[PDB]
Every structure is written in C-alpha cells, then in structure tokens.
RNA sequence: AUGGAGAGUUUGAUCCUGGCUCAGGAUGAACGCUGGCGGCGUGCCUAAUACAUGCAAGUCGAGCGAACGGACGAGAAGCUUGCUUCUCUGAUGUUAGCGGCGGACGGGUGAGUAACACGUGGAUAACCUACCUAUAAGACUGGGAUAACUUCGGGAAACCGGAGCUAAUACCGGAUAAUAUUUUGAACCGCAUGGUUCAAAAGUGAAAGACGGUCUUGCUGUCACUUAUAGAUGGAUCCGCGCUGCAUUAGCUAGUUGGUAAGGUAACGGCUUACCAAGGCAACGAUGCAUAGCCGACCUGAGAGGGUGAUCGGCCACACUGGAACUGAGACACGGUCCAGACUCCUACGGGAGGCAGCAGUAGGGAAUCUUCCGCAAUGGGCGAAAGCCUGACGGAGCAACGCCGCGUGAGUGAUGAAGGUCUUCGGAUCGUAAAACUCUGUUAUUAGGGAAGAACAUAUGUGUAAGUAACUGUGCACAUCUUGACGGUACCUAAUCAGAAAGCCACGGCUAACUACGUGCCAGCAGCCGCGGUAAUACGUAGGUGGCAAGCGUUAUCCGGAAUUAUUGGGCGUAAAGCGCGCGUAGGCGGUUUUUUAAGUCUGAUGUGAAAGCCCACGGCUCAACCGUGGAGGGUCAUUGGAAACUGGA
C-alpha cells in the first residue's frame, strides 16, 4: 500500500486482469474463508477492470450499464 | 407526479384501493406478479407495520423522505401522534384540492397544483406539499376556470368533507378547520405507522 | 475608535443587519461591545428599523461614532437631533 | 471596595522565614458517583513576625504576588 | 408521562453464563454504478511540503520644497496672419521626494503548547492605553540642518560615497505650564503593603500650522497641535474552580523554596543579581513519557452517559528554521529590519536577491477537496476637509449530487385484459390499465416580450434651526433636490409551441420487506453472522417477477446506539470469569441514643453573570420547505447576599 504496509487483498467477481505491478484500490472487508485476507480489491477502480458480463449488482463489481 | 408506476399493482399489493373506488381490487384482490395468485404466507409484525406505512404513503403519493419529515413535524405537535400525522397529511394542498373536487384523481390534483393552476388566498401556490392552514381559500387560476378537467370533475358531485367548504359556482374552497380522524380515511391504522417509525 | 455600525446577517441576496457598537479594528461579523438595534433594507419596500434610544444616546455621549448609513438611521429615528439638542443645552 | 477571598486552614509548615504554608481543605463531588471527596491545597502565606506555628488554625486573605509562589497573607490566628 | 422493541450463533435437545455478529443514526467522506433542475449551504482532513505568475496596503497637494504641464492669453510678420519663439503672466492639473497617519487591523494556518493555554468565577491598595468623546488650561520666543535637486566619483548588478544648494504640521534651544518628582504640615479611610483629600516650598517637563470668513494696524470658522483630568476602548498580571492518558514512569528540584538588599519592568514578583537560611513539590500522582490548540458547539443516546472539536463566533499560538532588537500608543512585526542555517536564484566571482499557513493557481503527497473570474454597487476598514483613492476584507459570479430542502421525468380515460417476454398442471397464469388509442396539462423545456428589491447615501445644491460671534464664513441638527448596482437584463412575470428531451441503484435463505426458471455443479463463485455451492441451489451467475428507495442507490472507513458487555442510573464473585492462604494494623471510607448550638454540606429566594450564533419553543419573511429574521425558554460543579434547619458535618 501507499503507507508501505504489505497486505493480502481479495479479488472479487468472476475473472480478473490483475498481474504483478498492477496499481489497485483496496477497501475494507475480510473474507471469512481465507485466513490472511482482511481487505478487498475494488473492481473498476484504477487498473482493476470491471467483471465482464455482470448484469446484476454491477456497481459492486465495477461494470458499466450494458445498454 | 413523483411515483408514476402502476397504481393498481400498488393497490393490489397493499390490499387497499388507492383510487378509493375498489376498481383495482374488484377482479384480482391479491398481490401482483408471478406468485400473486398463489397463497400468501402470513406477514410478520414488521411486515404489517411496513404495509400500513406504505398504504398511507402511496395513498398520498409522497416520497419516503418527505413522508418521514412530515411524520416528524406531526410528532412535534400536541395530541396523538398518529392522528396529528394523518390530519397534517390531509392538510396538503394536493389533498385539499382533491377533496374539494377540482380533480377526479389525487395525481390529477397534484398535476393541477404543480402546473400552477391553483390559487391560495388569491396568490399562486405551485407546491403540492404546501401545508394549508384553517381559514385559507383555495381557488382556480382565472385563466384555468374553464379547463375541461376541472369543470368535469366539479360537475361530478364528489362528496366534500365537513372540514372543507366548497362553492362549485365560483370554484372556490375554504379550509374551514382541521380535519377529524372520523373524516380521515378509515382503512389506515396510524398506530402501526407510529410503531413502524419506533423501529 | 468605538463605532456604531451595521453587522451583516441573513442569506445571499437577503441582507439583514444588526446595529451594533464595536471597536473599528474588530471584524465586521465578529466581536462587538453591545447591540442597539436592527435594520432591514429589503423588507416590504420600506426599511424596517428598530433602535434603542437610551443605548444609542449613551454610546454617542461616550464618543462612539456612527457609520454613514447608521447616522441616517439615527436621523430617521430622531436620535441625532436629541444628541444635538442635549449637547447644545449642556 | 471589592473584597479579596479569605480562607481558613491549619499551618503545616513554618520552616521558611516570614512564611507559613496553610492547608485548606475542601470537598470535590465526583462527577458521576456524586460522593464528596476530601481535597487539600497548600497556600503559601506571608507571616511577617513569624507569629504562627505548625498546627495552628489561621485565616488567610489573597494579596498581590509577594513571592514566586506566595499569594496570601495571614489575617489572624483562629486557634493555637 | 411525549420517552426506552430486538435477532442470529456453543447442544442430540435444554436452561444459564458469555463473547461475536446484525437491523438505527451521523460524516468536510472516498469509491462503484447512475444522473433533470432550482434554493440554501459545504468543499486540502494528507506535505506548518516546495512554490512559476498576477493581485492581497495604502493614503494625504487643505503639512513641504521642487519639477512637469503649461490653458486664458501676452510681442515680431516668415507676408505662411497661423503660425512663430522667449522677452512675460502664467489657470485647472499631475508627479518622484520630504513629512503625517496607516501598515500591530483585516486575511491565513493549527506547527508548537498538558499551560492560568482555554472555560467559568473573582482580584489589581501591583498596571498600561494612538485614534474617539468630554472638560479645563495653553499654543510664546529663536535656531541649525537635510532629502528632492545639481555635479563629481565607485560598482556587473543590487546599490553606495563626496561637494554644493533648499523647505516644512521635519529637527532642536529657551520661556511659560502639572494632581507627575522630592520635602514638610495636616484630615479622613481600607484589606498587610496601604487609599484619599487639602495646604507650603524645591527641582523638572509642552505645543503648529494649514485652508477659509469679515467691518481686515485684528478679530474669527473648521481642521490640526500641547498639557492635565475623566469617559470609552483595547491590552497586561494574579487567583479559586473545571479542563488528558500511562506507575512495566516514584521520587523531583539548587534560582531551586523562603528571606534581605539592589537592579529591572506599565506593573507585582527569583523577574534578575549578590548575600543568608534550607527549604519547595510529590501516592489528593510529583518528575518523566505519549498525545493534543481550547471553548461556544457538533454527532449519538429515553436518560445517565459516550464520541468529537469542519464550516461560523470567541480566546490562544505561529508567519522558511533559529536568535535579536529597532520604529511605534501598540510588534519583538505574514507581504519590516539585522544575524545564523537550509533551500532557490543572479553574478563581471568582488558580491547580490528571495519566503502563498493572503486570493487564484502550479508541482508533489493523497482515497479525496474548486476559478490564475467580476466589482468596490452593499457592509466593514485605512488615509483625506471632502470628492475620492486603496481594500483577493467583503459582495457576487464559476466549478463539484458533497449535503439539506423543494419540484419534475406527465395527467384523465382505457379490456379490447392486444403483441411480446416469463412461467406452466399446457387449462392457463403473470408483466398489466401497463401499452396502444383517445383526451388534457405545461411544472419544466424552448422561443419571444416585460422586468424588482437590494440604494442607505456621502458629496454638492437650497431652506430653516441650535451653539458661538461684532458680524461672517464655517459647525451640529432638521427638511427638501440631483446623482450612484458587480451581480444583470439575473430573479420574477407574461405569451406561444411541445409528452415531447428528464430513472437509476440495491436487494428478494433467516435476521429483513420482496420467488420462480434456467445455467453451474464444494467448480465458478457468494458471505455481516448463521452459512451456501459436490447435478431438482428461493444463498452462485443470468432471466422473468417482486421488494426497498429515488437523482440517487450501494460499498468502504470512522463515531454513538443496540451493549445492563465497566452496570451512578443499571451487573457480579459456592460450582460459569471473579474472595488476597491468614493475621496485626496505617491512611482513608463509614459509624449507637438524647439535648443545645452552628450553619460547611442540604433546602428555599434575590442580585450579577454564564457573548452572539446554535439546540428547543413561538411568531414573522422567502409561492412551500430547507433557509433567513425576531422574541422567549434552557444551559454553572458560578459568585454575592437573605432566610429554613430535618438529615450529614463542626462545637
Ligand atoms: Mg499539534
Ligand atoms: Mg441506552
Ligand atoms: Mg506586516
Ligand atoms: Mg506572504
Ligand atoms: Mg430529494
Ligand atoms: Mg451478490
Ligand atoms: Mg453502555
Ligand atoms: Mg471459577
Ligand atoms: Mg478465605
Ligand atoms: Mg446564547
């Protein structure tokens, strides 16, 4: 992170474009299944792309209106 | 208006005729949509409270924010909260115009006020949310005295509540006094609405 | 020095003023010594003026000096004549 | 004439010259619980003649700063 | 009486204990999706990081010398009587400089500060105060200079040096003048020190002119000047009380604590310095460490409480970092100076220049926060006699759903329940009065006309009046007249045309309002918790339908609530977490009965104060509301003073 703390962030949605050296926005929220992951990646912010073909709850996954 | 959706579907869901005639409930007195015809499970206590609140809200065609603000100001007054809320809802220029009978529908009455056809104390008031107080005279704009909608609505001799006093010849009403719970719609259980806003 | 002046209130394009006794170095809408009245320029096509003669005269005696609009107000309310009359009579 | 504050306390130190330390006891109610709790403050007082002695009840009045820490003077000796 | 909801989850099942989680409200929010408008607000929280450029502090010719400009209009005819020069007068004007005042305000920021910083209540018989007001007494008599200017010289520059000349409301001497200073008489008074008032001497301390009026070998108006004493204003110091975490921080202090004397300060004072003594502080938390501007308020809560300190107002602190003084009534001074440091820039290398935590704006940092705008028309401030000038204060405009409030995206009729999508028991059911059709409307939109308030004025111009004068001009006051608007042709209003351009977002197993189909198959995924998904998933993804909201809807972060889970209100300690292994005891807390008394606690009044804004209540103004205004009400553990005396305390 910008504060220089290293963290594990969950990538939500089906499919992702992220690679090493990608720049991402991280929000709060832990994944209960995953022990070390206490944060989520924000979809459709900075480098992270929106989930492709998401047509319900698009705002959560960074997808624009399909029309 | 603001909500412009199916008034029938909203009536059928809430089990009350929003038009006040029962035309919506005559053929299909059950909730809209796929599962409407099938049996409806019993409502929870929250479900009943919400239903009653929605009934009153959609009856007066108000948005939730404004409905809740009106509920608050009503609560700040003296007496029974639920009754005060209902009389305050009835005192809206919207409701007053409709009840005088210048329009045949509440939405129509709202459009009449919103398009600037109505006069209050001789002056143009265009806010449907305007709170009419006792002693004020509601009139039609001099240009709009011969509107087909208004004339036809007035010709249909709609019953005018006792708290109002309408003269159809002059198309002039008077808000004589505050309504009474007796005069207000009987299908609403305001206590449930108070409870709803309690939690 | 000490000044009898108008402090601005109200909203944008709706001025209301309180007639106050203030030190000149004080900010317009800041520290005051006393409020003596109010003035409303935009009210009903007639300036609505409330002023306390007892307070205004006490301050005028002690060397407080009106701004031009305030002098007009104290003239309209008759305080400026009273100040002159006493002062000449003294 | 405006009146300066007067306190009554017991002399707890007479070691300094022309000075006595007087402990004034007051009660501070607890903000939440409401019980009054005993509280003491030592007041440095001017005693020109070194009249007072440890253990004597004394009356002190506020003055201008007479020293770095002394703000009170001895009005009288109430008990000895 | 105006105010108080619970739910899930430990088990095979149970009751209890207990934590965890959720439903609410709030924000200077950010992010995702989406997006019509208006009103009123709000908008660098992070780098007190660095800052290109313009602007943010001037003004006064009625203080002064000087210079420019030279009207009006002076002379010769070039024979050009329209053009000409210096041999003049030279008006309205203007400016570099001197001098006065301002620049200590207004504006910014919260770094530092755990402190009498701040809040609240007191004190100063320990203070200071330009301008303003009032009163009284004065403003006399002389002098020597110096900017500008001229000339010379030295510098790359910044900018210096010499000579000559010249004014002032600039500077200086003397006179006269104190309630100031010393000394000696008293008189009265308070709260130690002391206050006050009246007499007699001694030393010592001022000042100024300018512009006008007139009856002009002298009076006078306005403004300015000096001294003394008050008022007003602002500032300073002291003190009671309140105001933060940590003891896995227990000792701390030697100008330190006090005294004496002197110096110093507006002033008291270890404020400082010598001298003398050994004090002072601390478990009622000193000292240290960490963190922090404080408050009015703000958010939440039924309340008690808990959390916080944006915008606005008050107080404090700071101005590249550190130190220091100068000028001044006031500064140890944001856009002043000097020095040191870091940084940036210029240089002829000798030496110079600079400080956005003013307004915009830029770079950087950041999840994230605006235009290098218009006007001094209003309000306020500086200067001026005034017009006026200056004013990034401020009034406006711009940008951003960032918030709050208001109004839209249509309304009536409409079975003929059309088509189509979806589901299906293949009957149908649902989307759905929804649509279409028909009729109507114009908020809004568009187009075209009209068109506010905000403006008071000041000044000038008349008239009157009051004071003063010999009178006048002026001066104060009163009443008339002209003229002044950035916004802006904006708001608003009117008419014409058109449903046309104006709905999205989340959710639907339970909590929790709203279910089906299909695809998928412990995968892909979901998830606040209980969990869900391994082939007939109301939990994934999509579709239809529904629900909740709406120009928003969701997510994340953070605070209060629910949480009686730090329990005063309002919990406990046999077995659930929790009685020290047990004595002796110190401080502290608490304590039997009666009488008398006191009145600290307690109770009951009065007085002052607790700014304004806000909250609350009422009323009034904006088409309504938000918002604005006004009046109440409330808010102290407050101070002072008068009663009551049961209880607690004291005797
Ligand atoms: Mg800090
Ligand atoms: Mg509670
Ligand atoms: Mg400065
Ligand atoms: Mg600056
Ligand atoms: Mg809204
Ligand atoms: Mg989902
Ligand atoms: Mg609690
Ligand atoms: Mg146990
Ligand atoms: Mg035991
Ligand atoms: Mg107040």
Curated annotation (Swiss-Prot), chain A:
Region Disordered: start-end pairs: 49-67
Q: Which superkingdom heads the taxonomic lineage of this protein's source? A: Bacteria
Coiled-coil segments on the chain, per record: none
Family from the record = Belongs to the universal ribosomal protein uS12 family.
Q: How does it assemble?
A: Part of the 30S ribosomal subunit. Contacts proteins S8 and S17. May interact with IF1 in the 30S initiation complex.
The free-text function statement in the UniProt record for this protein reads: With S4 and S5 plays an important role in translational accuracy.
Provide the protein name: Small ribosomal subunit protein uS12
What stretch of the complete protein does the chain hold? 70 to 136 of 137
From Swiss-Prot, chain B:
SUPFAM superfamilies linked: Alpha-L RNA-binding motif
GO MF term set: rRNA binding; structural constituent of ribosome
In which domain of life is the source organism classified? Answer: Bacteria
- Spans traversing the lipid bilayer: none
Keywords, sorted A to Z: Ribonucleoprotein, Ribosomal protein, RNA-binding, rRNA-binding
Q: Where is the signal peptide?
A: none
Annotated InterPro entries: Ribosomal_uS4, Ribosomal_uS4_bac-type, Ribosomal_uS4_CS, Ribosomal_uS4_N, S4_RNA-bd, S4_RNA-bd_sf
An example of a Gene Ontology cellular component annotation for this protein is: small ribosomal subunit
Entry keyword annotation includes RNA-binding: yes
Q: Cite the record's note on assembly.
A: Part of the 30S ribosomal subunit. Contacts protein S5. The interaction surface between S4 and S5 is involved in control of translational fidelity.
Protein family according to the UniProt entry: Belongs to the universal ribosomal protein uS4 family.
Q: Which PANTHER family match?
A: 30S 40S RIBOSOMAL PROTEIN, SMALL RIBOSOMAL SUBUNIT PROTEIN US4M
Protein purpose: One of the primary rRNA binding proteins, it binds directly to 16S rRNA where it nucleates assembly of the body of the 30S subunit.
| Name of this chain's protein | Small ribosomal subunit protein uS4
Q: Which organism is it from?
A: Staphylococcus aureus (strain NCTC 8325 / PS 47)
Curated annotation (Swiss-Prot), chain C:
Among its keywords, does the record have Ion transport? no
InterPro entries, per this entry?
Ribosomal_bS16, Ribosomal_bS16_dom_sf
Q: Which PANTHER family match?
A: 30S RIBOSOMAL PROTEIN S16, SMALL RIBOSOMAL SUBUNIT PROTEIN BS16M
Q: Name one GO biological process term.
A: translation
| Source organism of the structure | Staphylococcus aureus (strain NCTC 8325 / PS 47)
Task: Extract the GO molecular function terms from the UniProt entry.
Answer: structural constituent of ribosome
- Output this protein's name: Small ribosomal subunit protein bS16
Provide an example Pfam family for this protein. Ribosomal_S16
Tell me the keywords, alphabetical order. Ribonucleoprotein, Ribosomal protein
According to the record, the segments passing through the membrane are none
Q: What are the record's GO terms for cellular component?
A: cytoplasm; small ribosomal subunit
Q: Which family does it belong to?
A: Belongs to the bacterial ribosomal protein bS16 family.
Swiss-Prot record, chain D:
Range of residues in the leader sequence: none
The organism's superkingdom is given as Bacteria
Show the InterPro entries listed in the entry: NA-bd_OB-fold, Ribosomal_uS17, Ribosomal_uS17_bact/chlr, Ribosomal_uS17_CS
**Key words, A-Z:** Ribonucleoprotein, Ribosomal protein, RNA-binding, rRNA-binding
A Gene Ontology biological process in which this protein takes part is: translation
**Example of a GO cellular component annotation carried by this entry:** cytosolic small ribosomal subunit
Q: Which GO terms describe its molecular function?
A: rRNA binding; structural constituent of ribosome
| SUPFAM superfamilies according to UniProt | Nucleic acid-binding proteins
Q: List the disulfide bonds.
A: none
Any Pfam family hit: Ribosomal_S17
Q: How does it assemble?
A: Part of the 30S ribosomal subunit.
Family named by the database record: Belongs to the universal ribosomal protein uS17 family.
What this chain does, per the record? One of the primary rRNA binding proteins, it binds specifically to the 5'-end of 16S ribosomal RNA.
This protein's name: Small ribosomal subunit protein uS17
Tell me the lineage of the source organism. Bacteria, Bacillati, Bacillota, Bacilli, Bacillales
């Amino acid at each position: 992170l910008s504060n220089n703390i290293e963290i594990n962030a969950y990538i939500p949605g089906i499919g992702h474009n992220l690679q090493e050296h990608s720049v991402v926005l991280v929000r709060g929220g832990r994944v209960k299944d995953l022990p070390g992951v206490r944060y989520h990646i924000v979809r459709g912010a900075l480098d992270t792309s929106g989930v492709d073909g998401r047509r319900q709850g698009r705002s959560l996954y960074g997808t624009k209106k399909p029309k | 208006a603001r909500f412009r959706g199916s008034n029938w579907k909203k009536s059928r869901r809430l089990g009350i005729s929003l038009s006040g005639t029962g035309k919506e409930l005559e053929k299909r007195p059950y909730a809209p949509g796929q599962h409407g015809p099938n049996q409806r499970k019993k409502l929870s206590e929250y479900g009943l409270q919400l239903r009653e609140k929605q009934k009153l809200r959609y009856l007066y065609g108000m948005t939730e924010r404004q409905f809740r603000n009106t509920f608050d100001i009503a609560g700040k007054k003296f007496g029974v909260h639920g009754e005060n809320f209902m009389i305050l809802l009835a005192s809206r220029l919207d409701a007053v115009v409709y009840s005088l009978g210048l329009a045949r529908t509440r939405r129509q009455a709202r459009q009449l006020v919103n398009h600037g056809h109505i006069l209050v104390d001789g002056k143009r008031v265009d806010i449907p949310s305007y709170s009419v107080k006792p002693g004020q005279t509601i009139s039609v704009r001099e240009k709009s005295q011969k509107l087909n909608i208004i004339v036809e609505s007035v010709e249909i001799n709609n019953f005018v509540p006792e708290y109002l006093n309408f003269d159809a010849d002059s198309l002039t009403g008077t808000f004589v006094r505050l309504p009474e719970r007796s005069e207000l719609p009987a299908e609403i259980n305001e206590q449930l609405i108070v409870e709803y806003y309690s939690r | 020095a000490v000044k009898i002046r108008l402090t601005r209130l109200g909203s944008k394009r709706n001025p209301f003023y309180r007639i106050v006794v203030a030190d000149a170095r004080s900010p317009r809408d800041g520290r005051i010594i006393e409020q003596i009245g109010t003035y409303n320029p935009t009210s009903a096509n007639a300036p609505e003026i409330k002023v306390d003669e007892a307070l205004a005269l006490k301050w005028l005696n002690d060397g407080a000096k009106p701004t031009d609009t305030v002098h007009n107000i104290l003239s309209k309310e008759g305080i400026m004549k009273k100040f002159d009359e006493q002062k000449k009579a003294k | 004439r405006n009146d300066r504050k007067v306190y009554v306390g017991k002399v707890v130190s007479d070691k300094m010259d022309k000075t006595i330390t007087v402990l004034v006891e007051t009660y501070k109610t607890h903000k939440l619980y409401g019980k009054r709790v005993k509280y003491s403050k030592k007041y440095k007082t001017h005693d020109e003649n070194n009249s007072a002695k440890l253990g004597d009840i004394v009356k002190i009045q506020e003055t201008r700063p007479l020293s770095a820490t002394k703000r009170f003077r001895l009005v009288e000796i109430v008990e000895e």
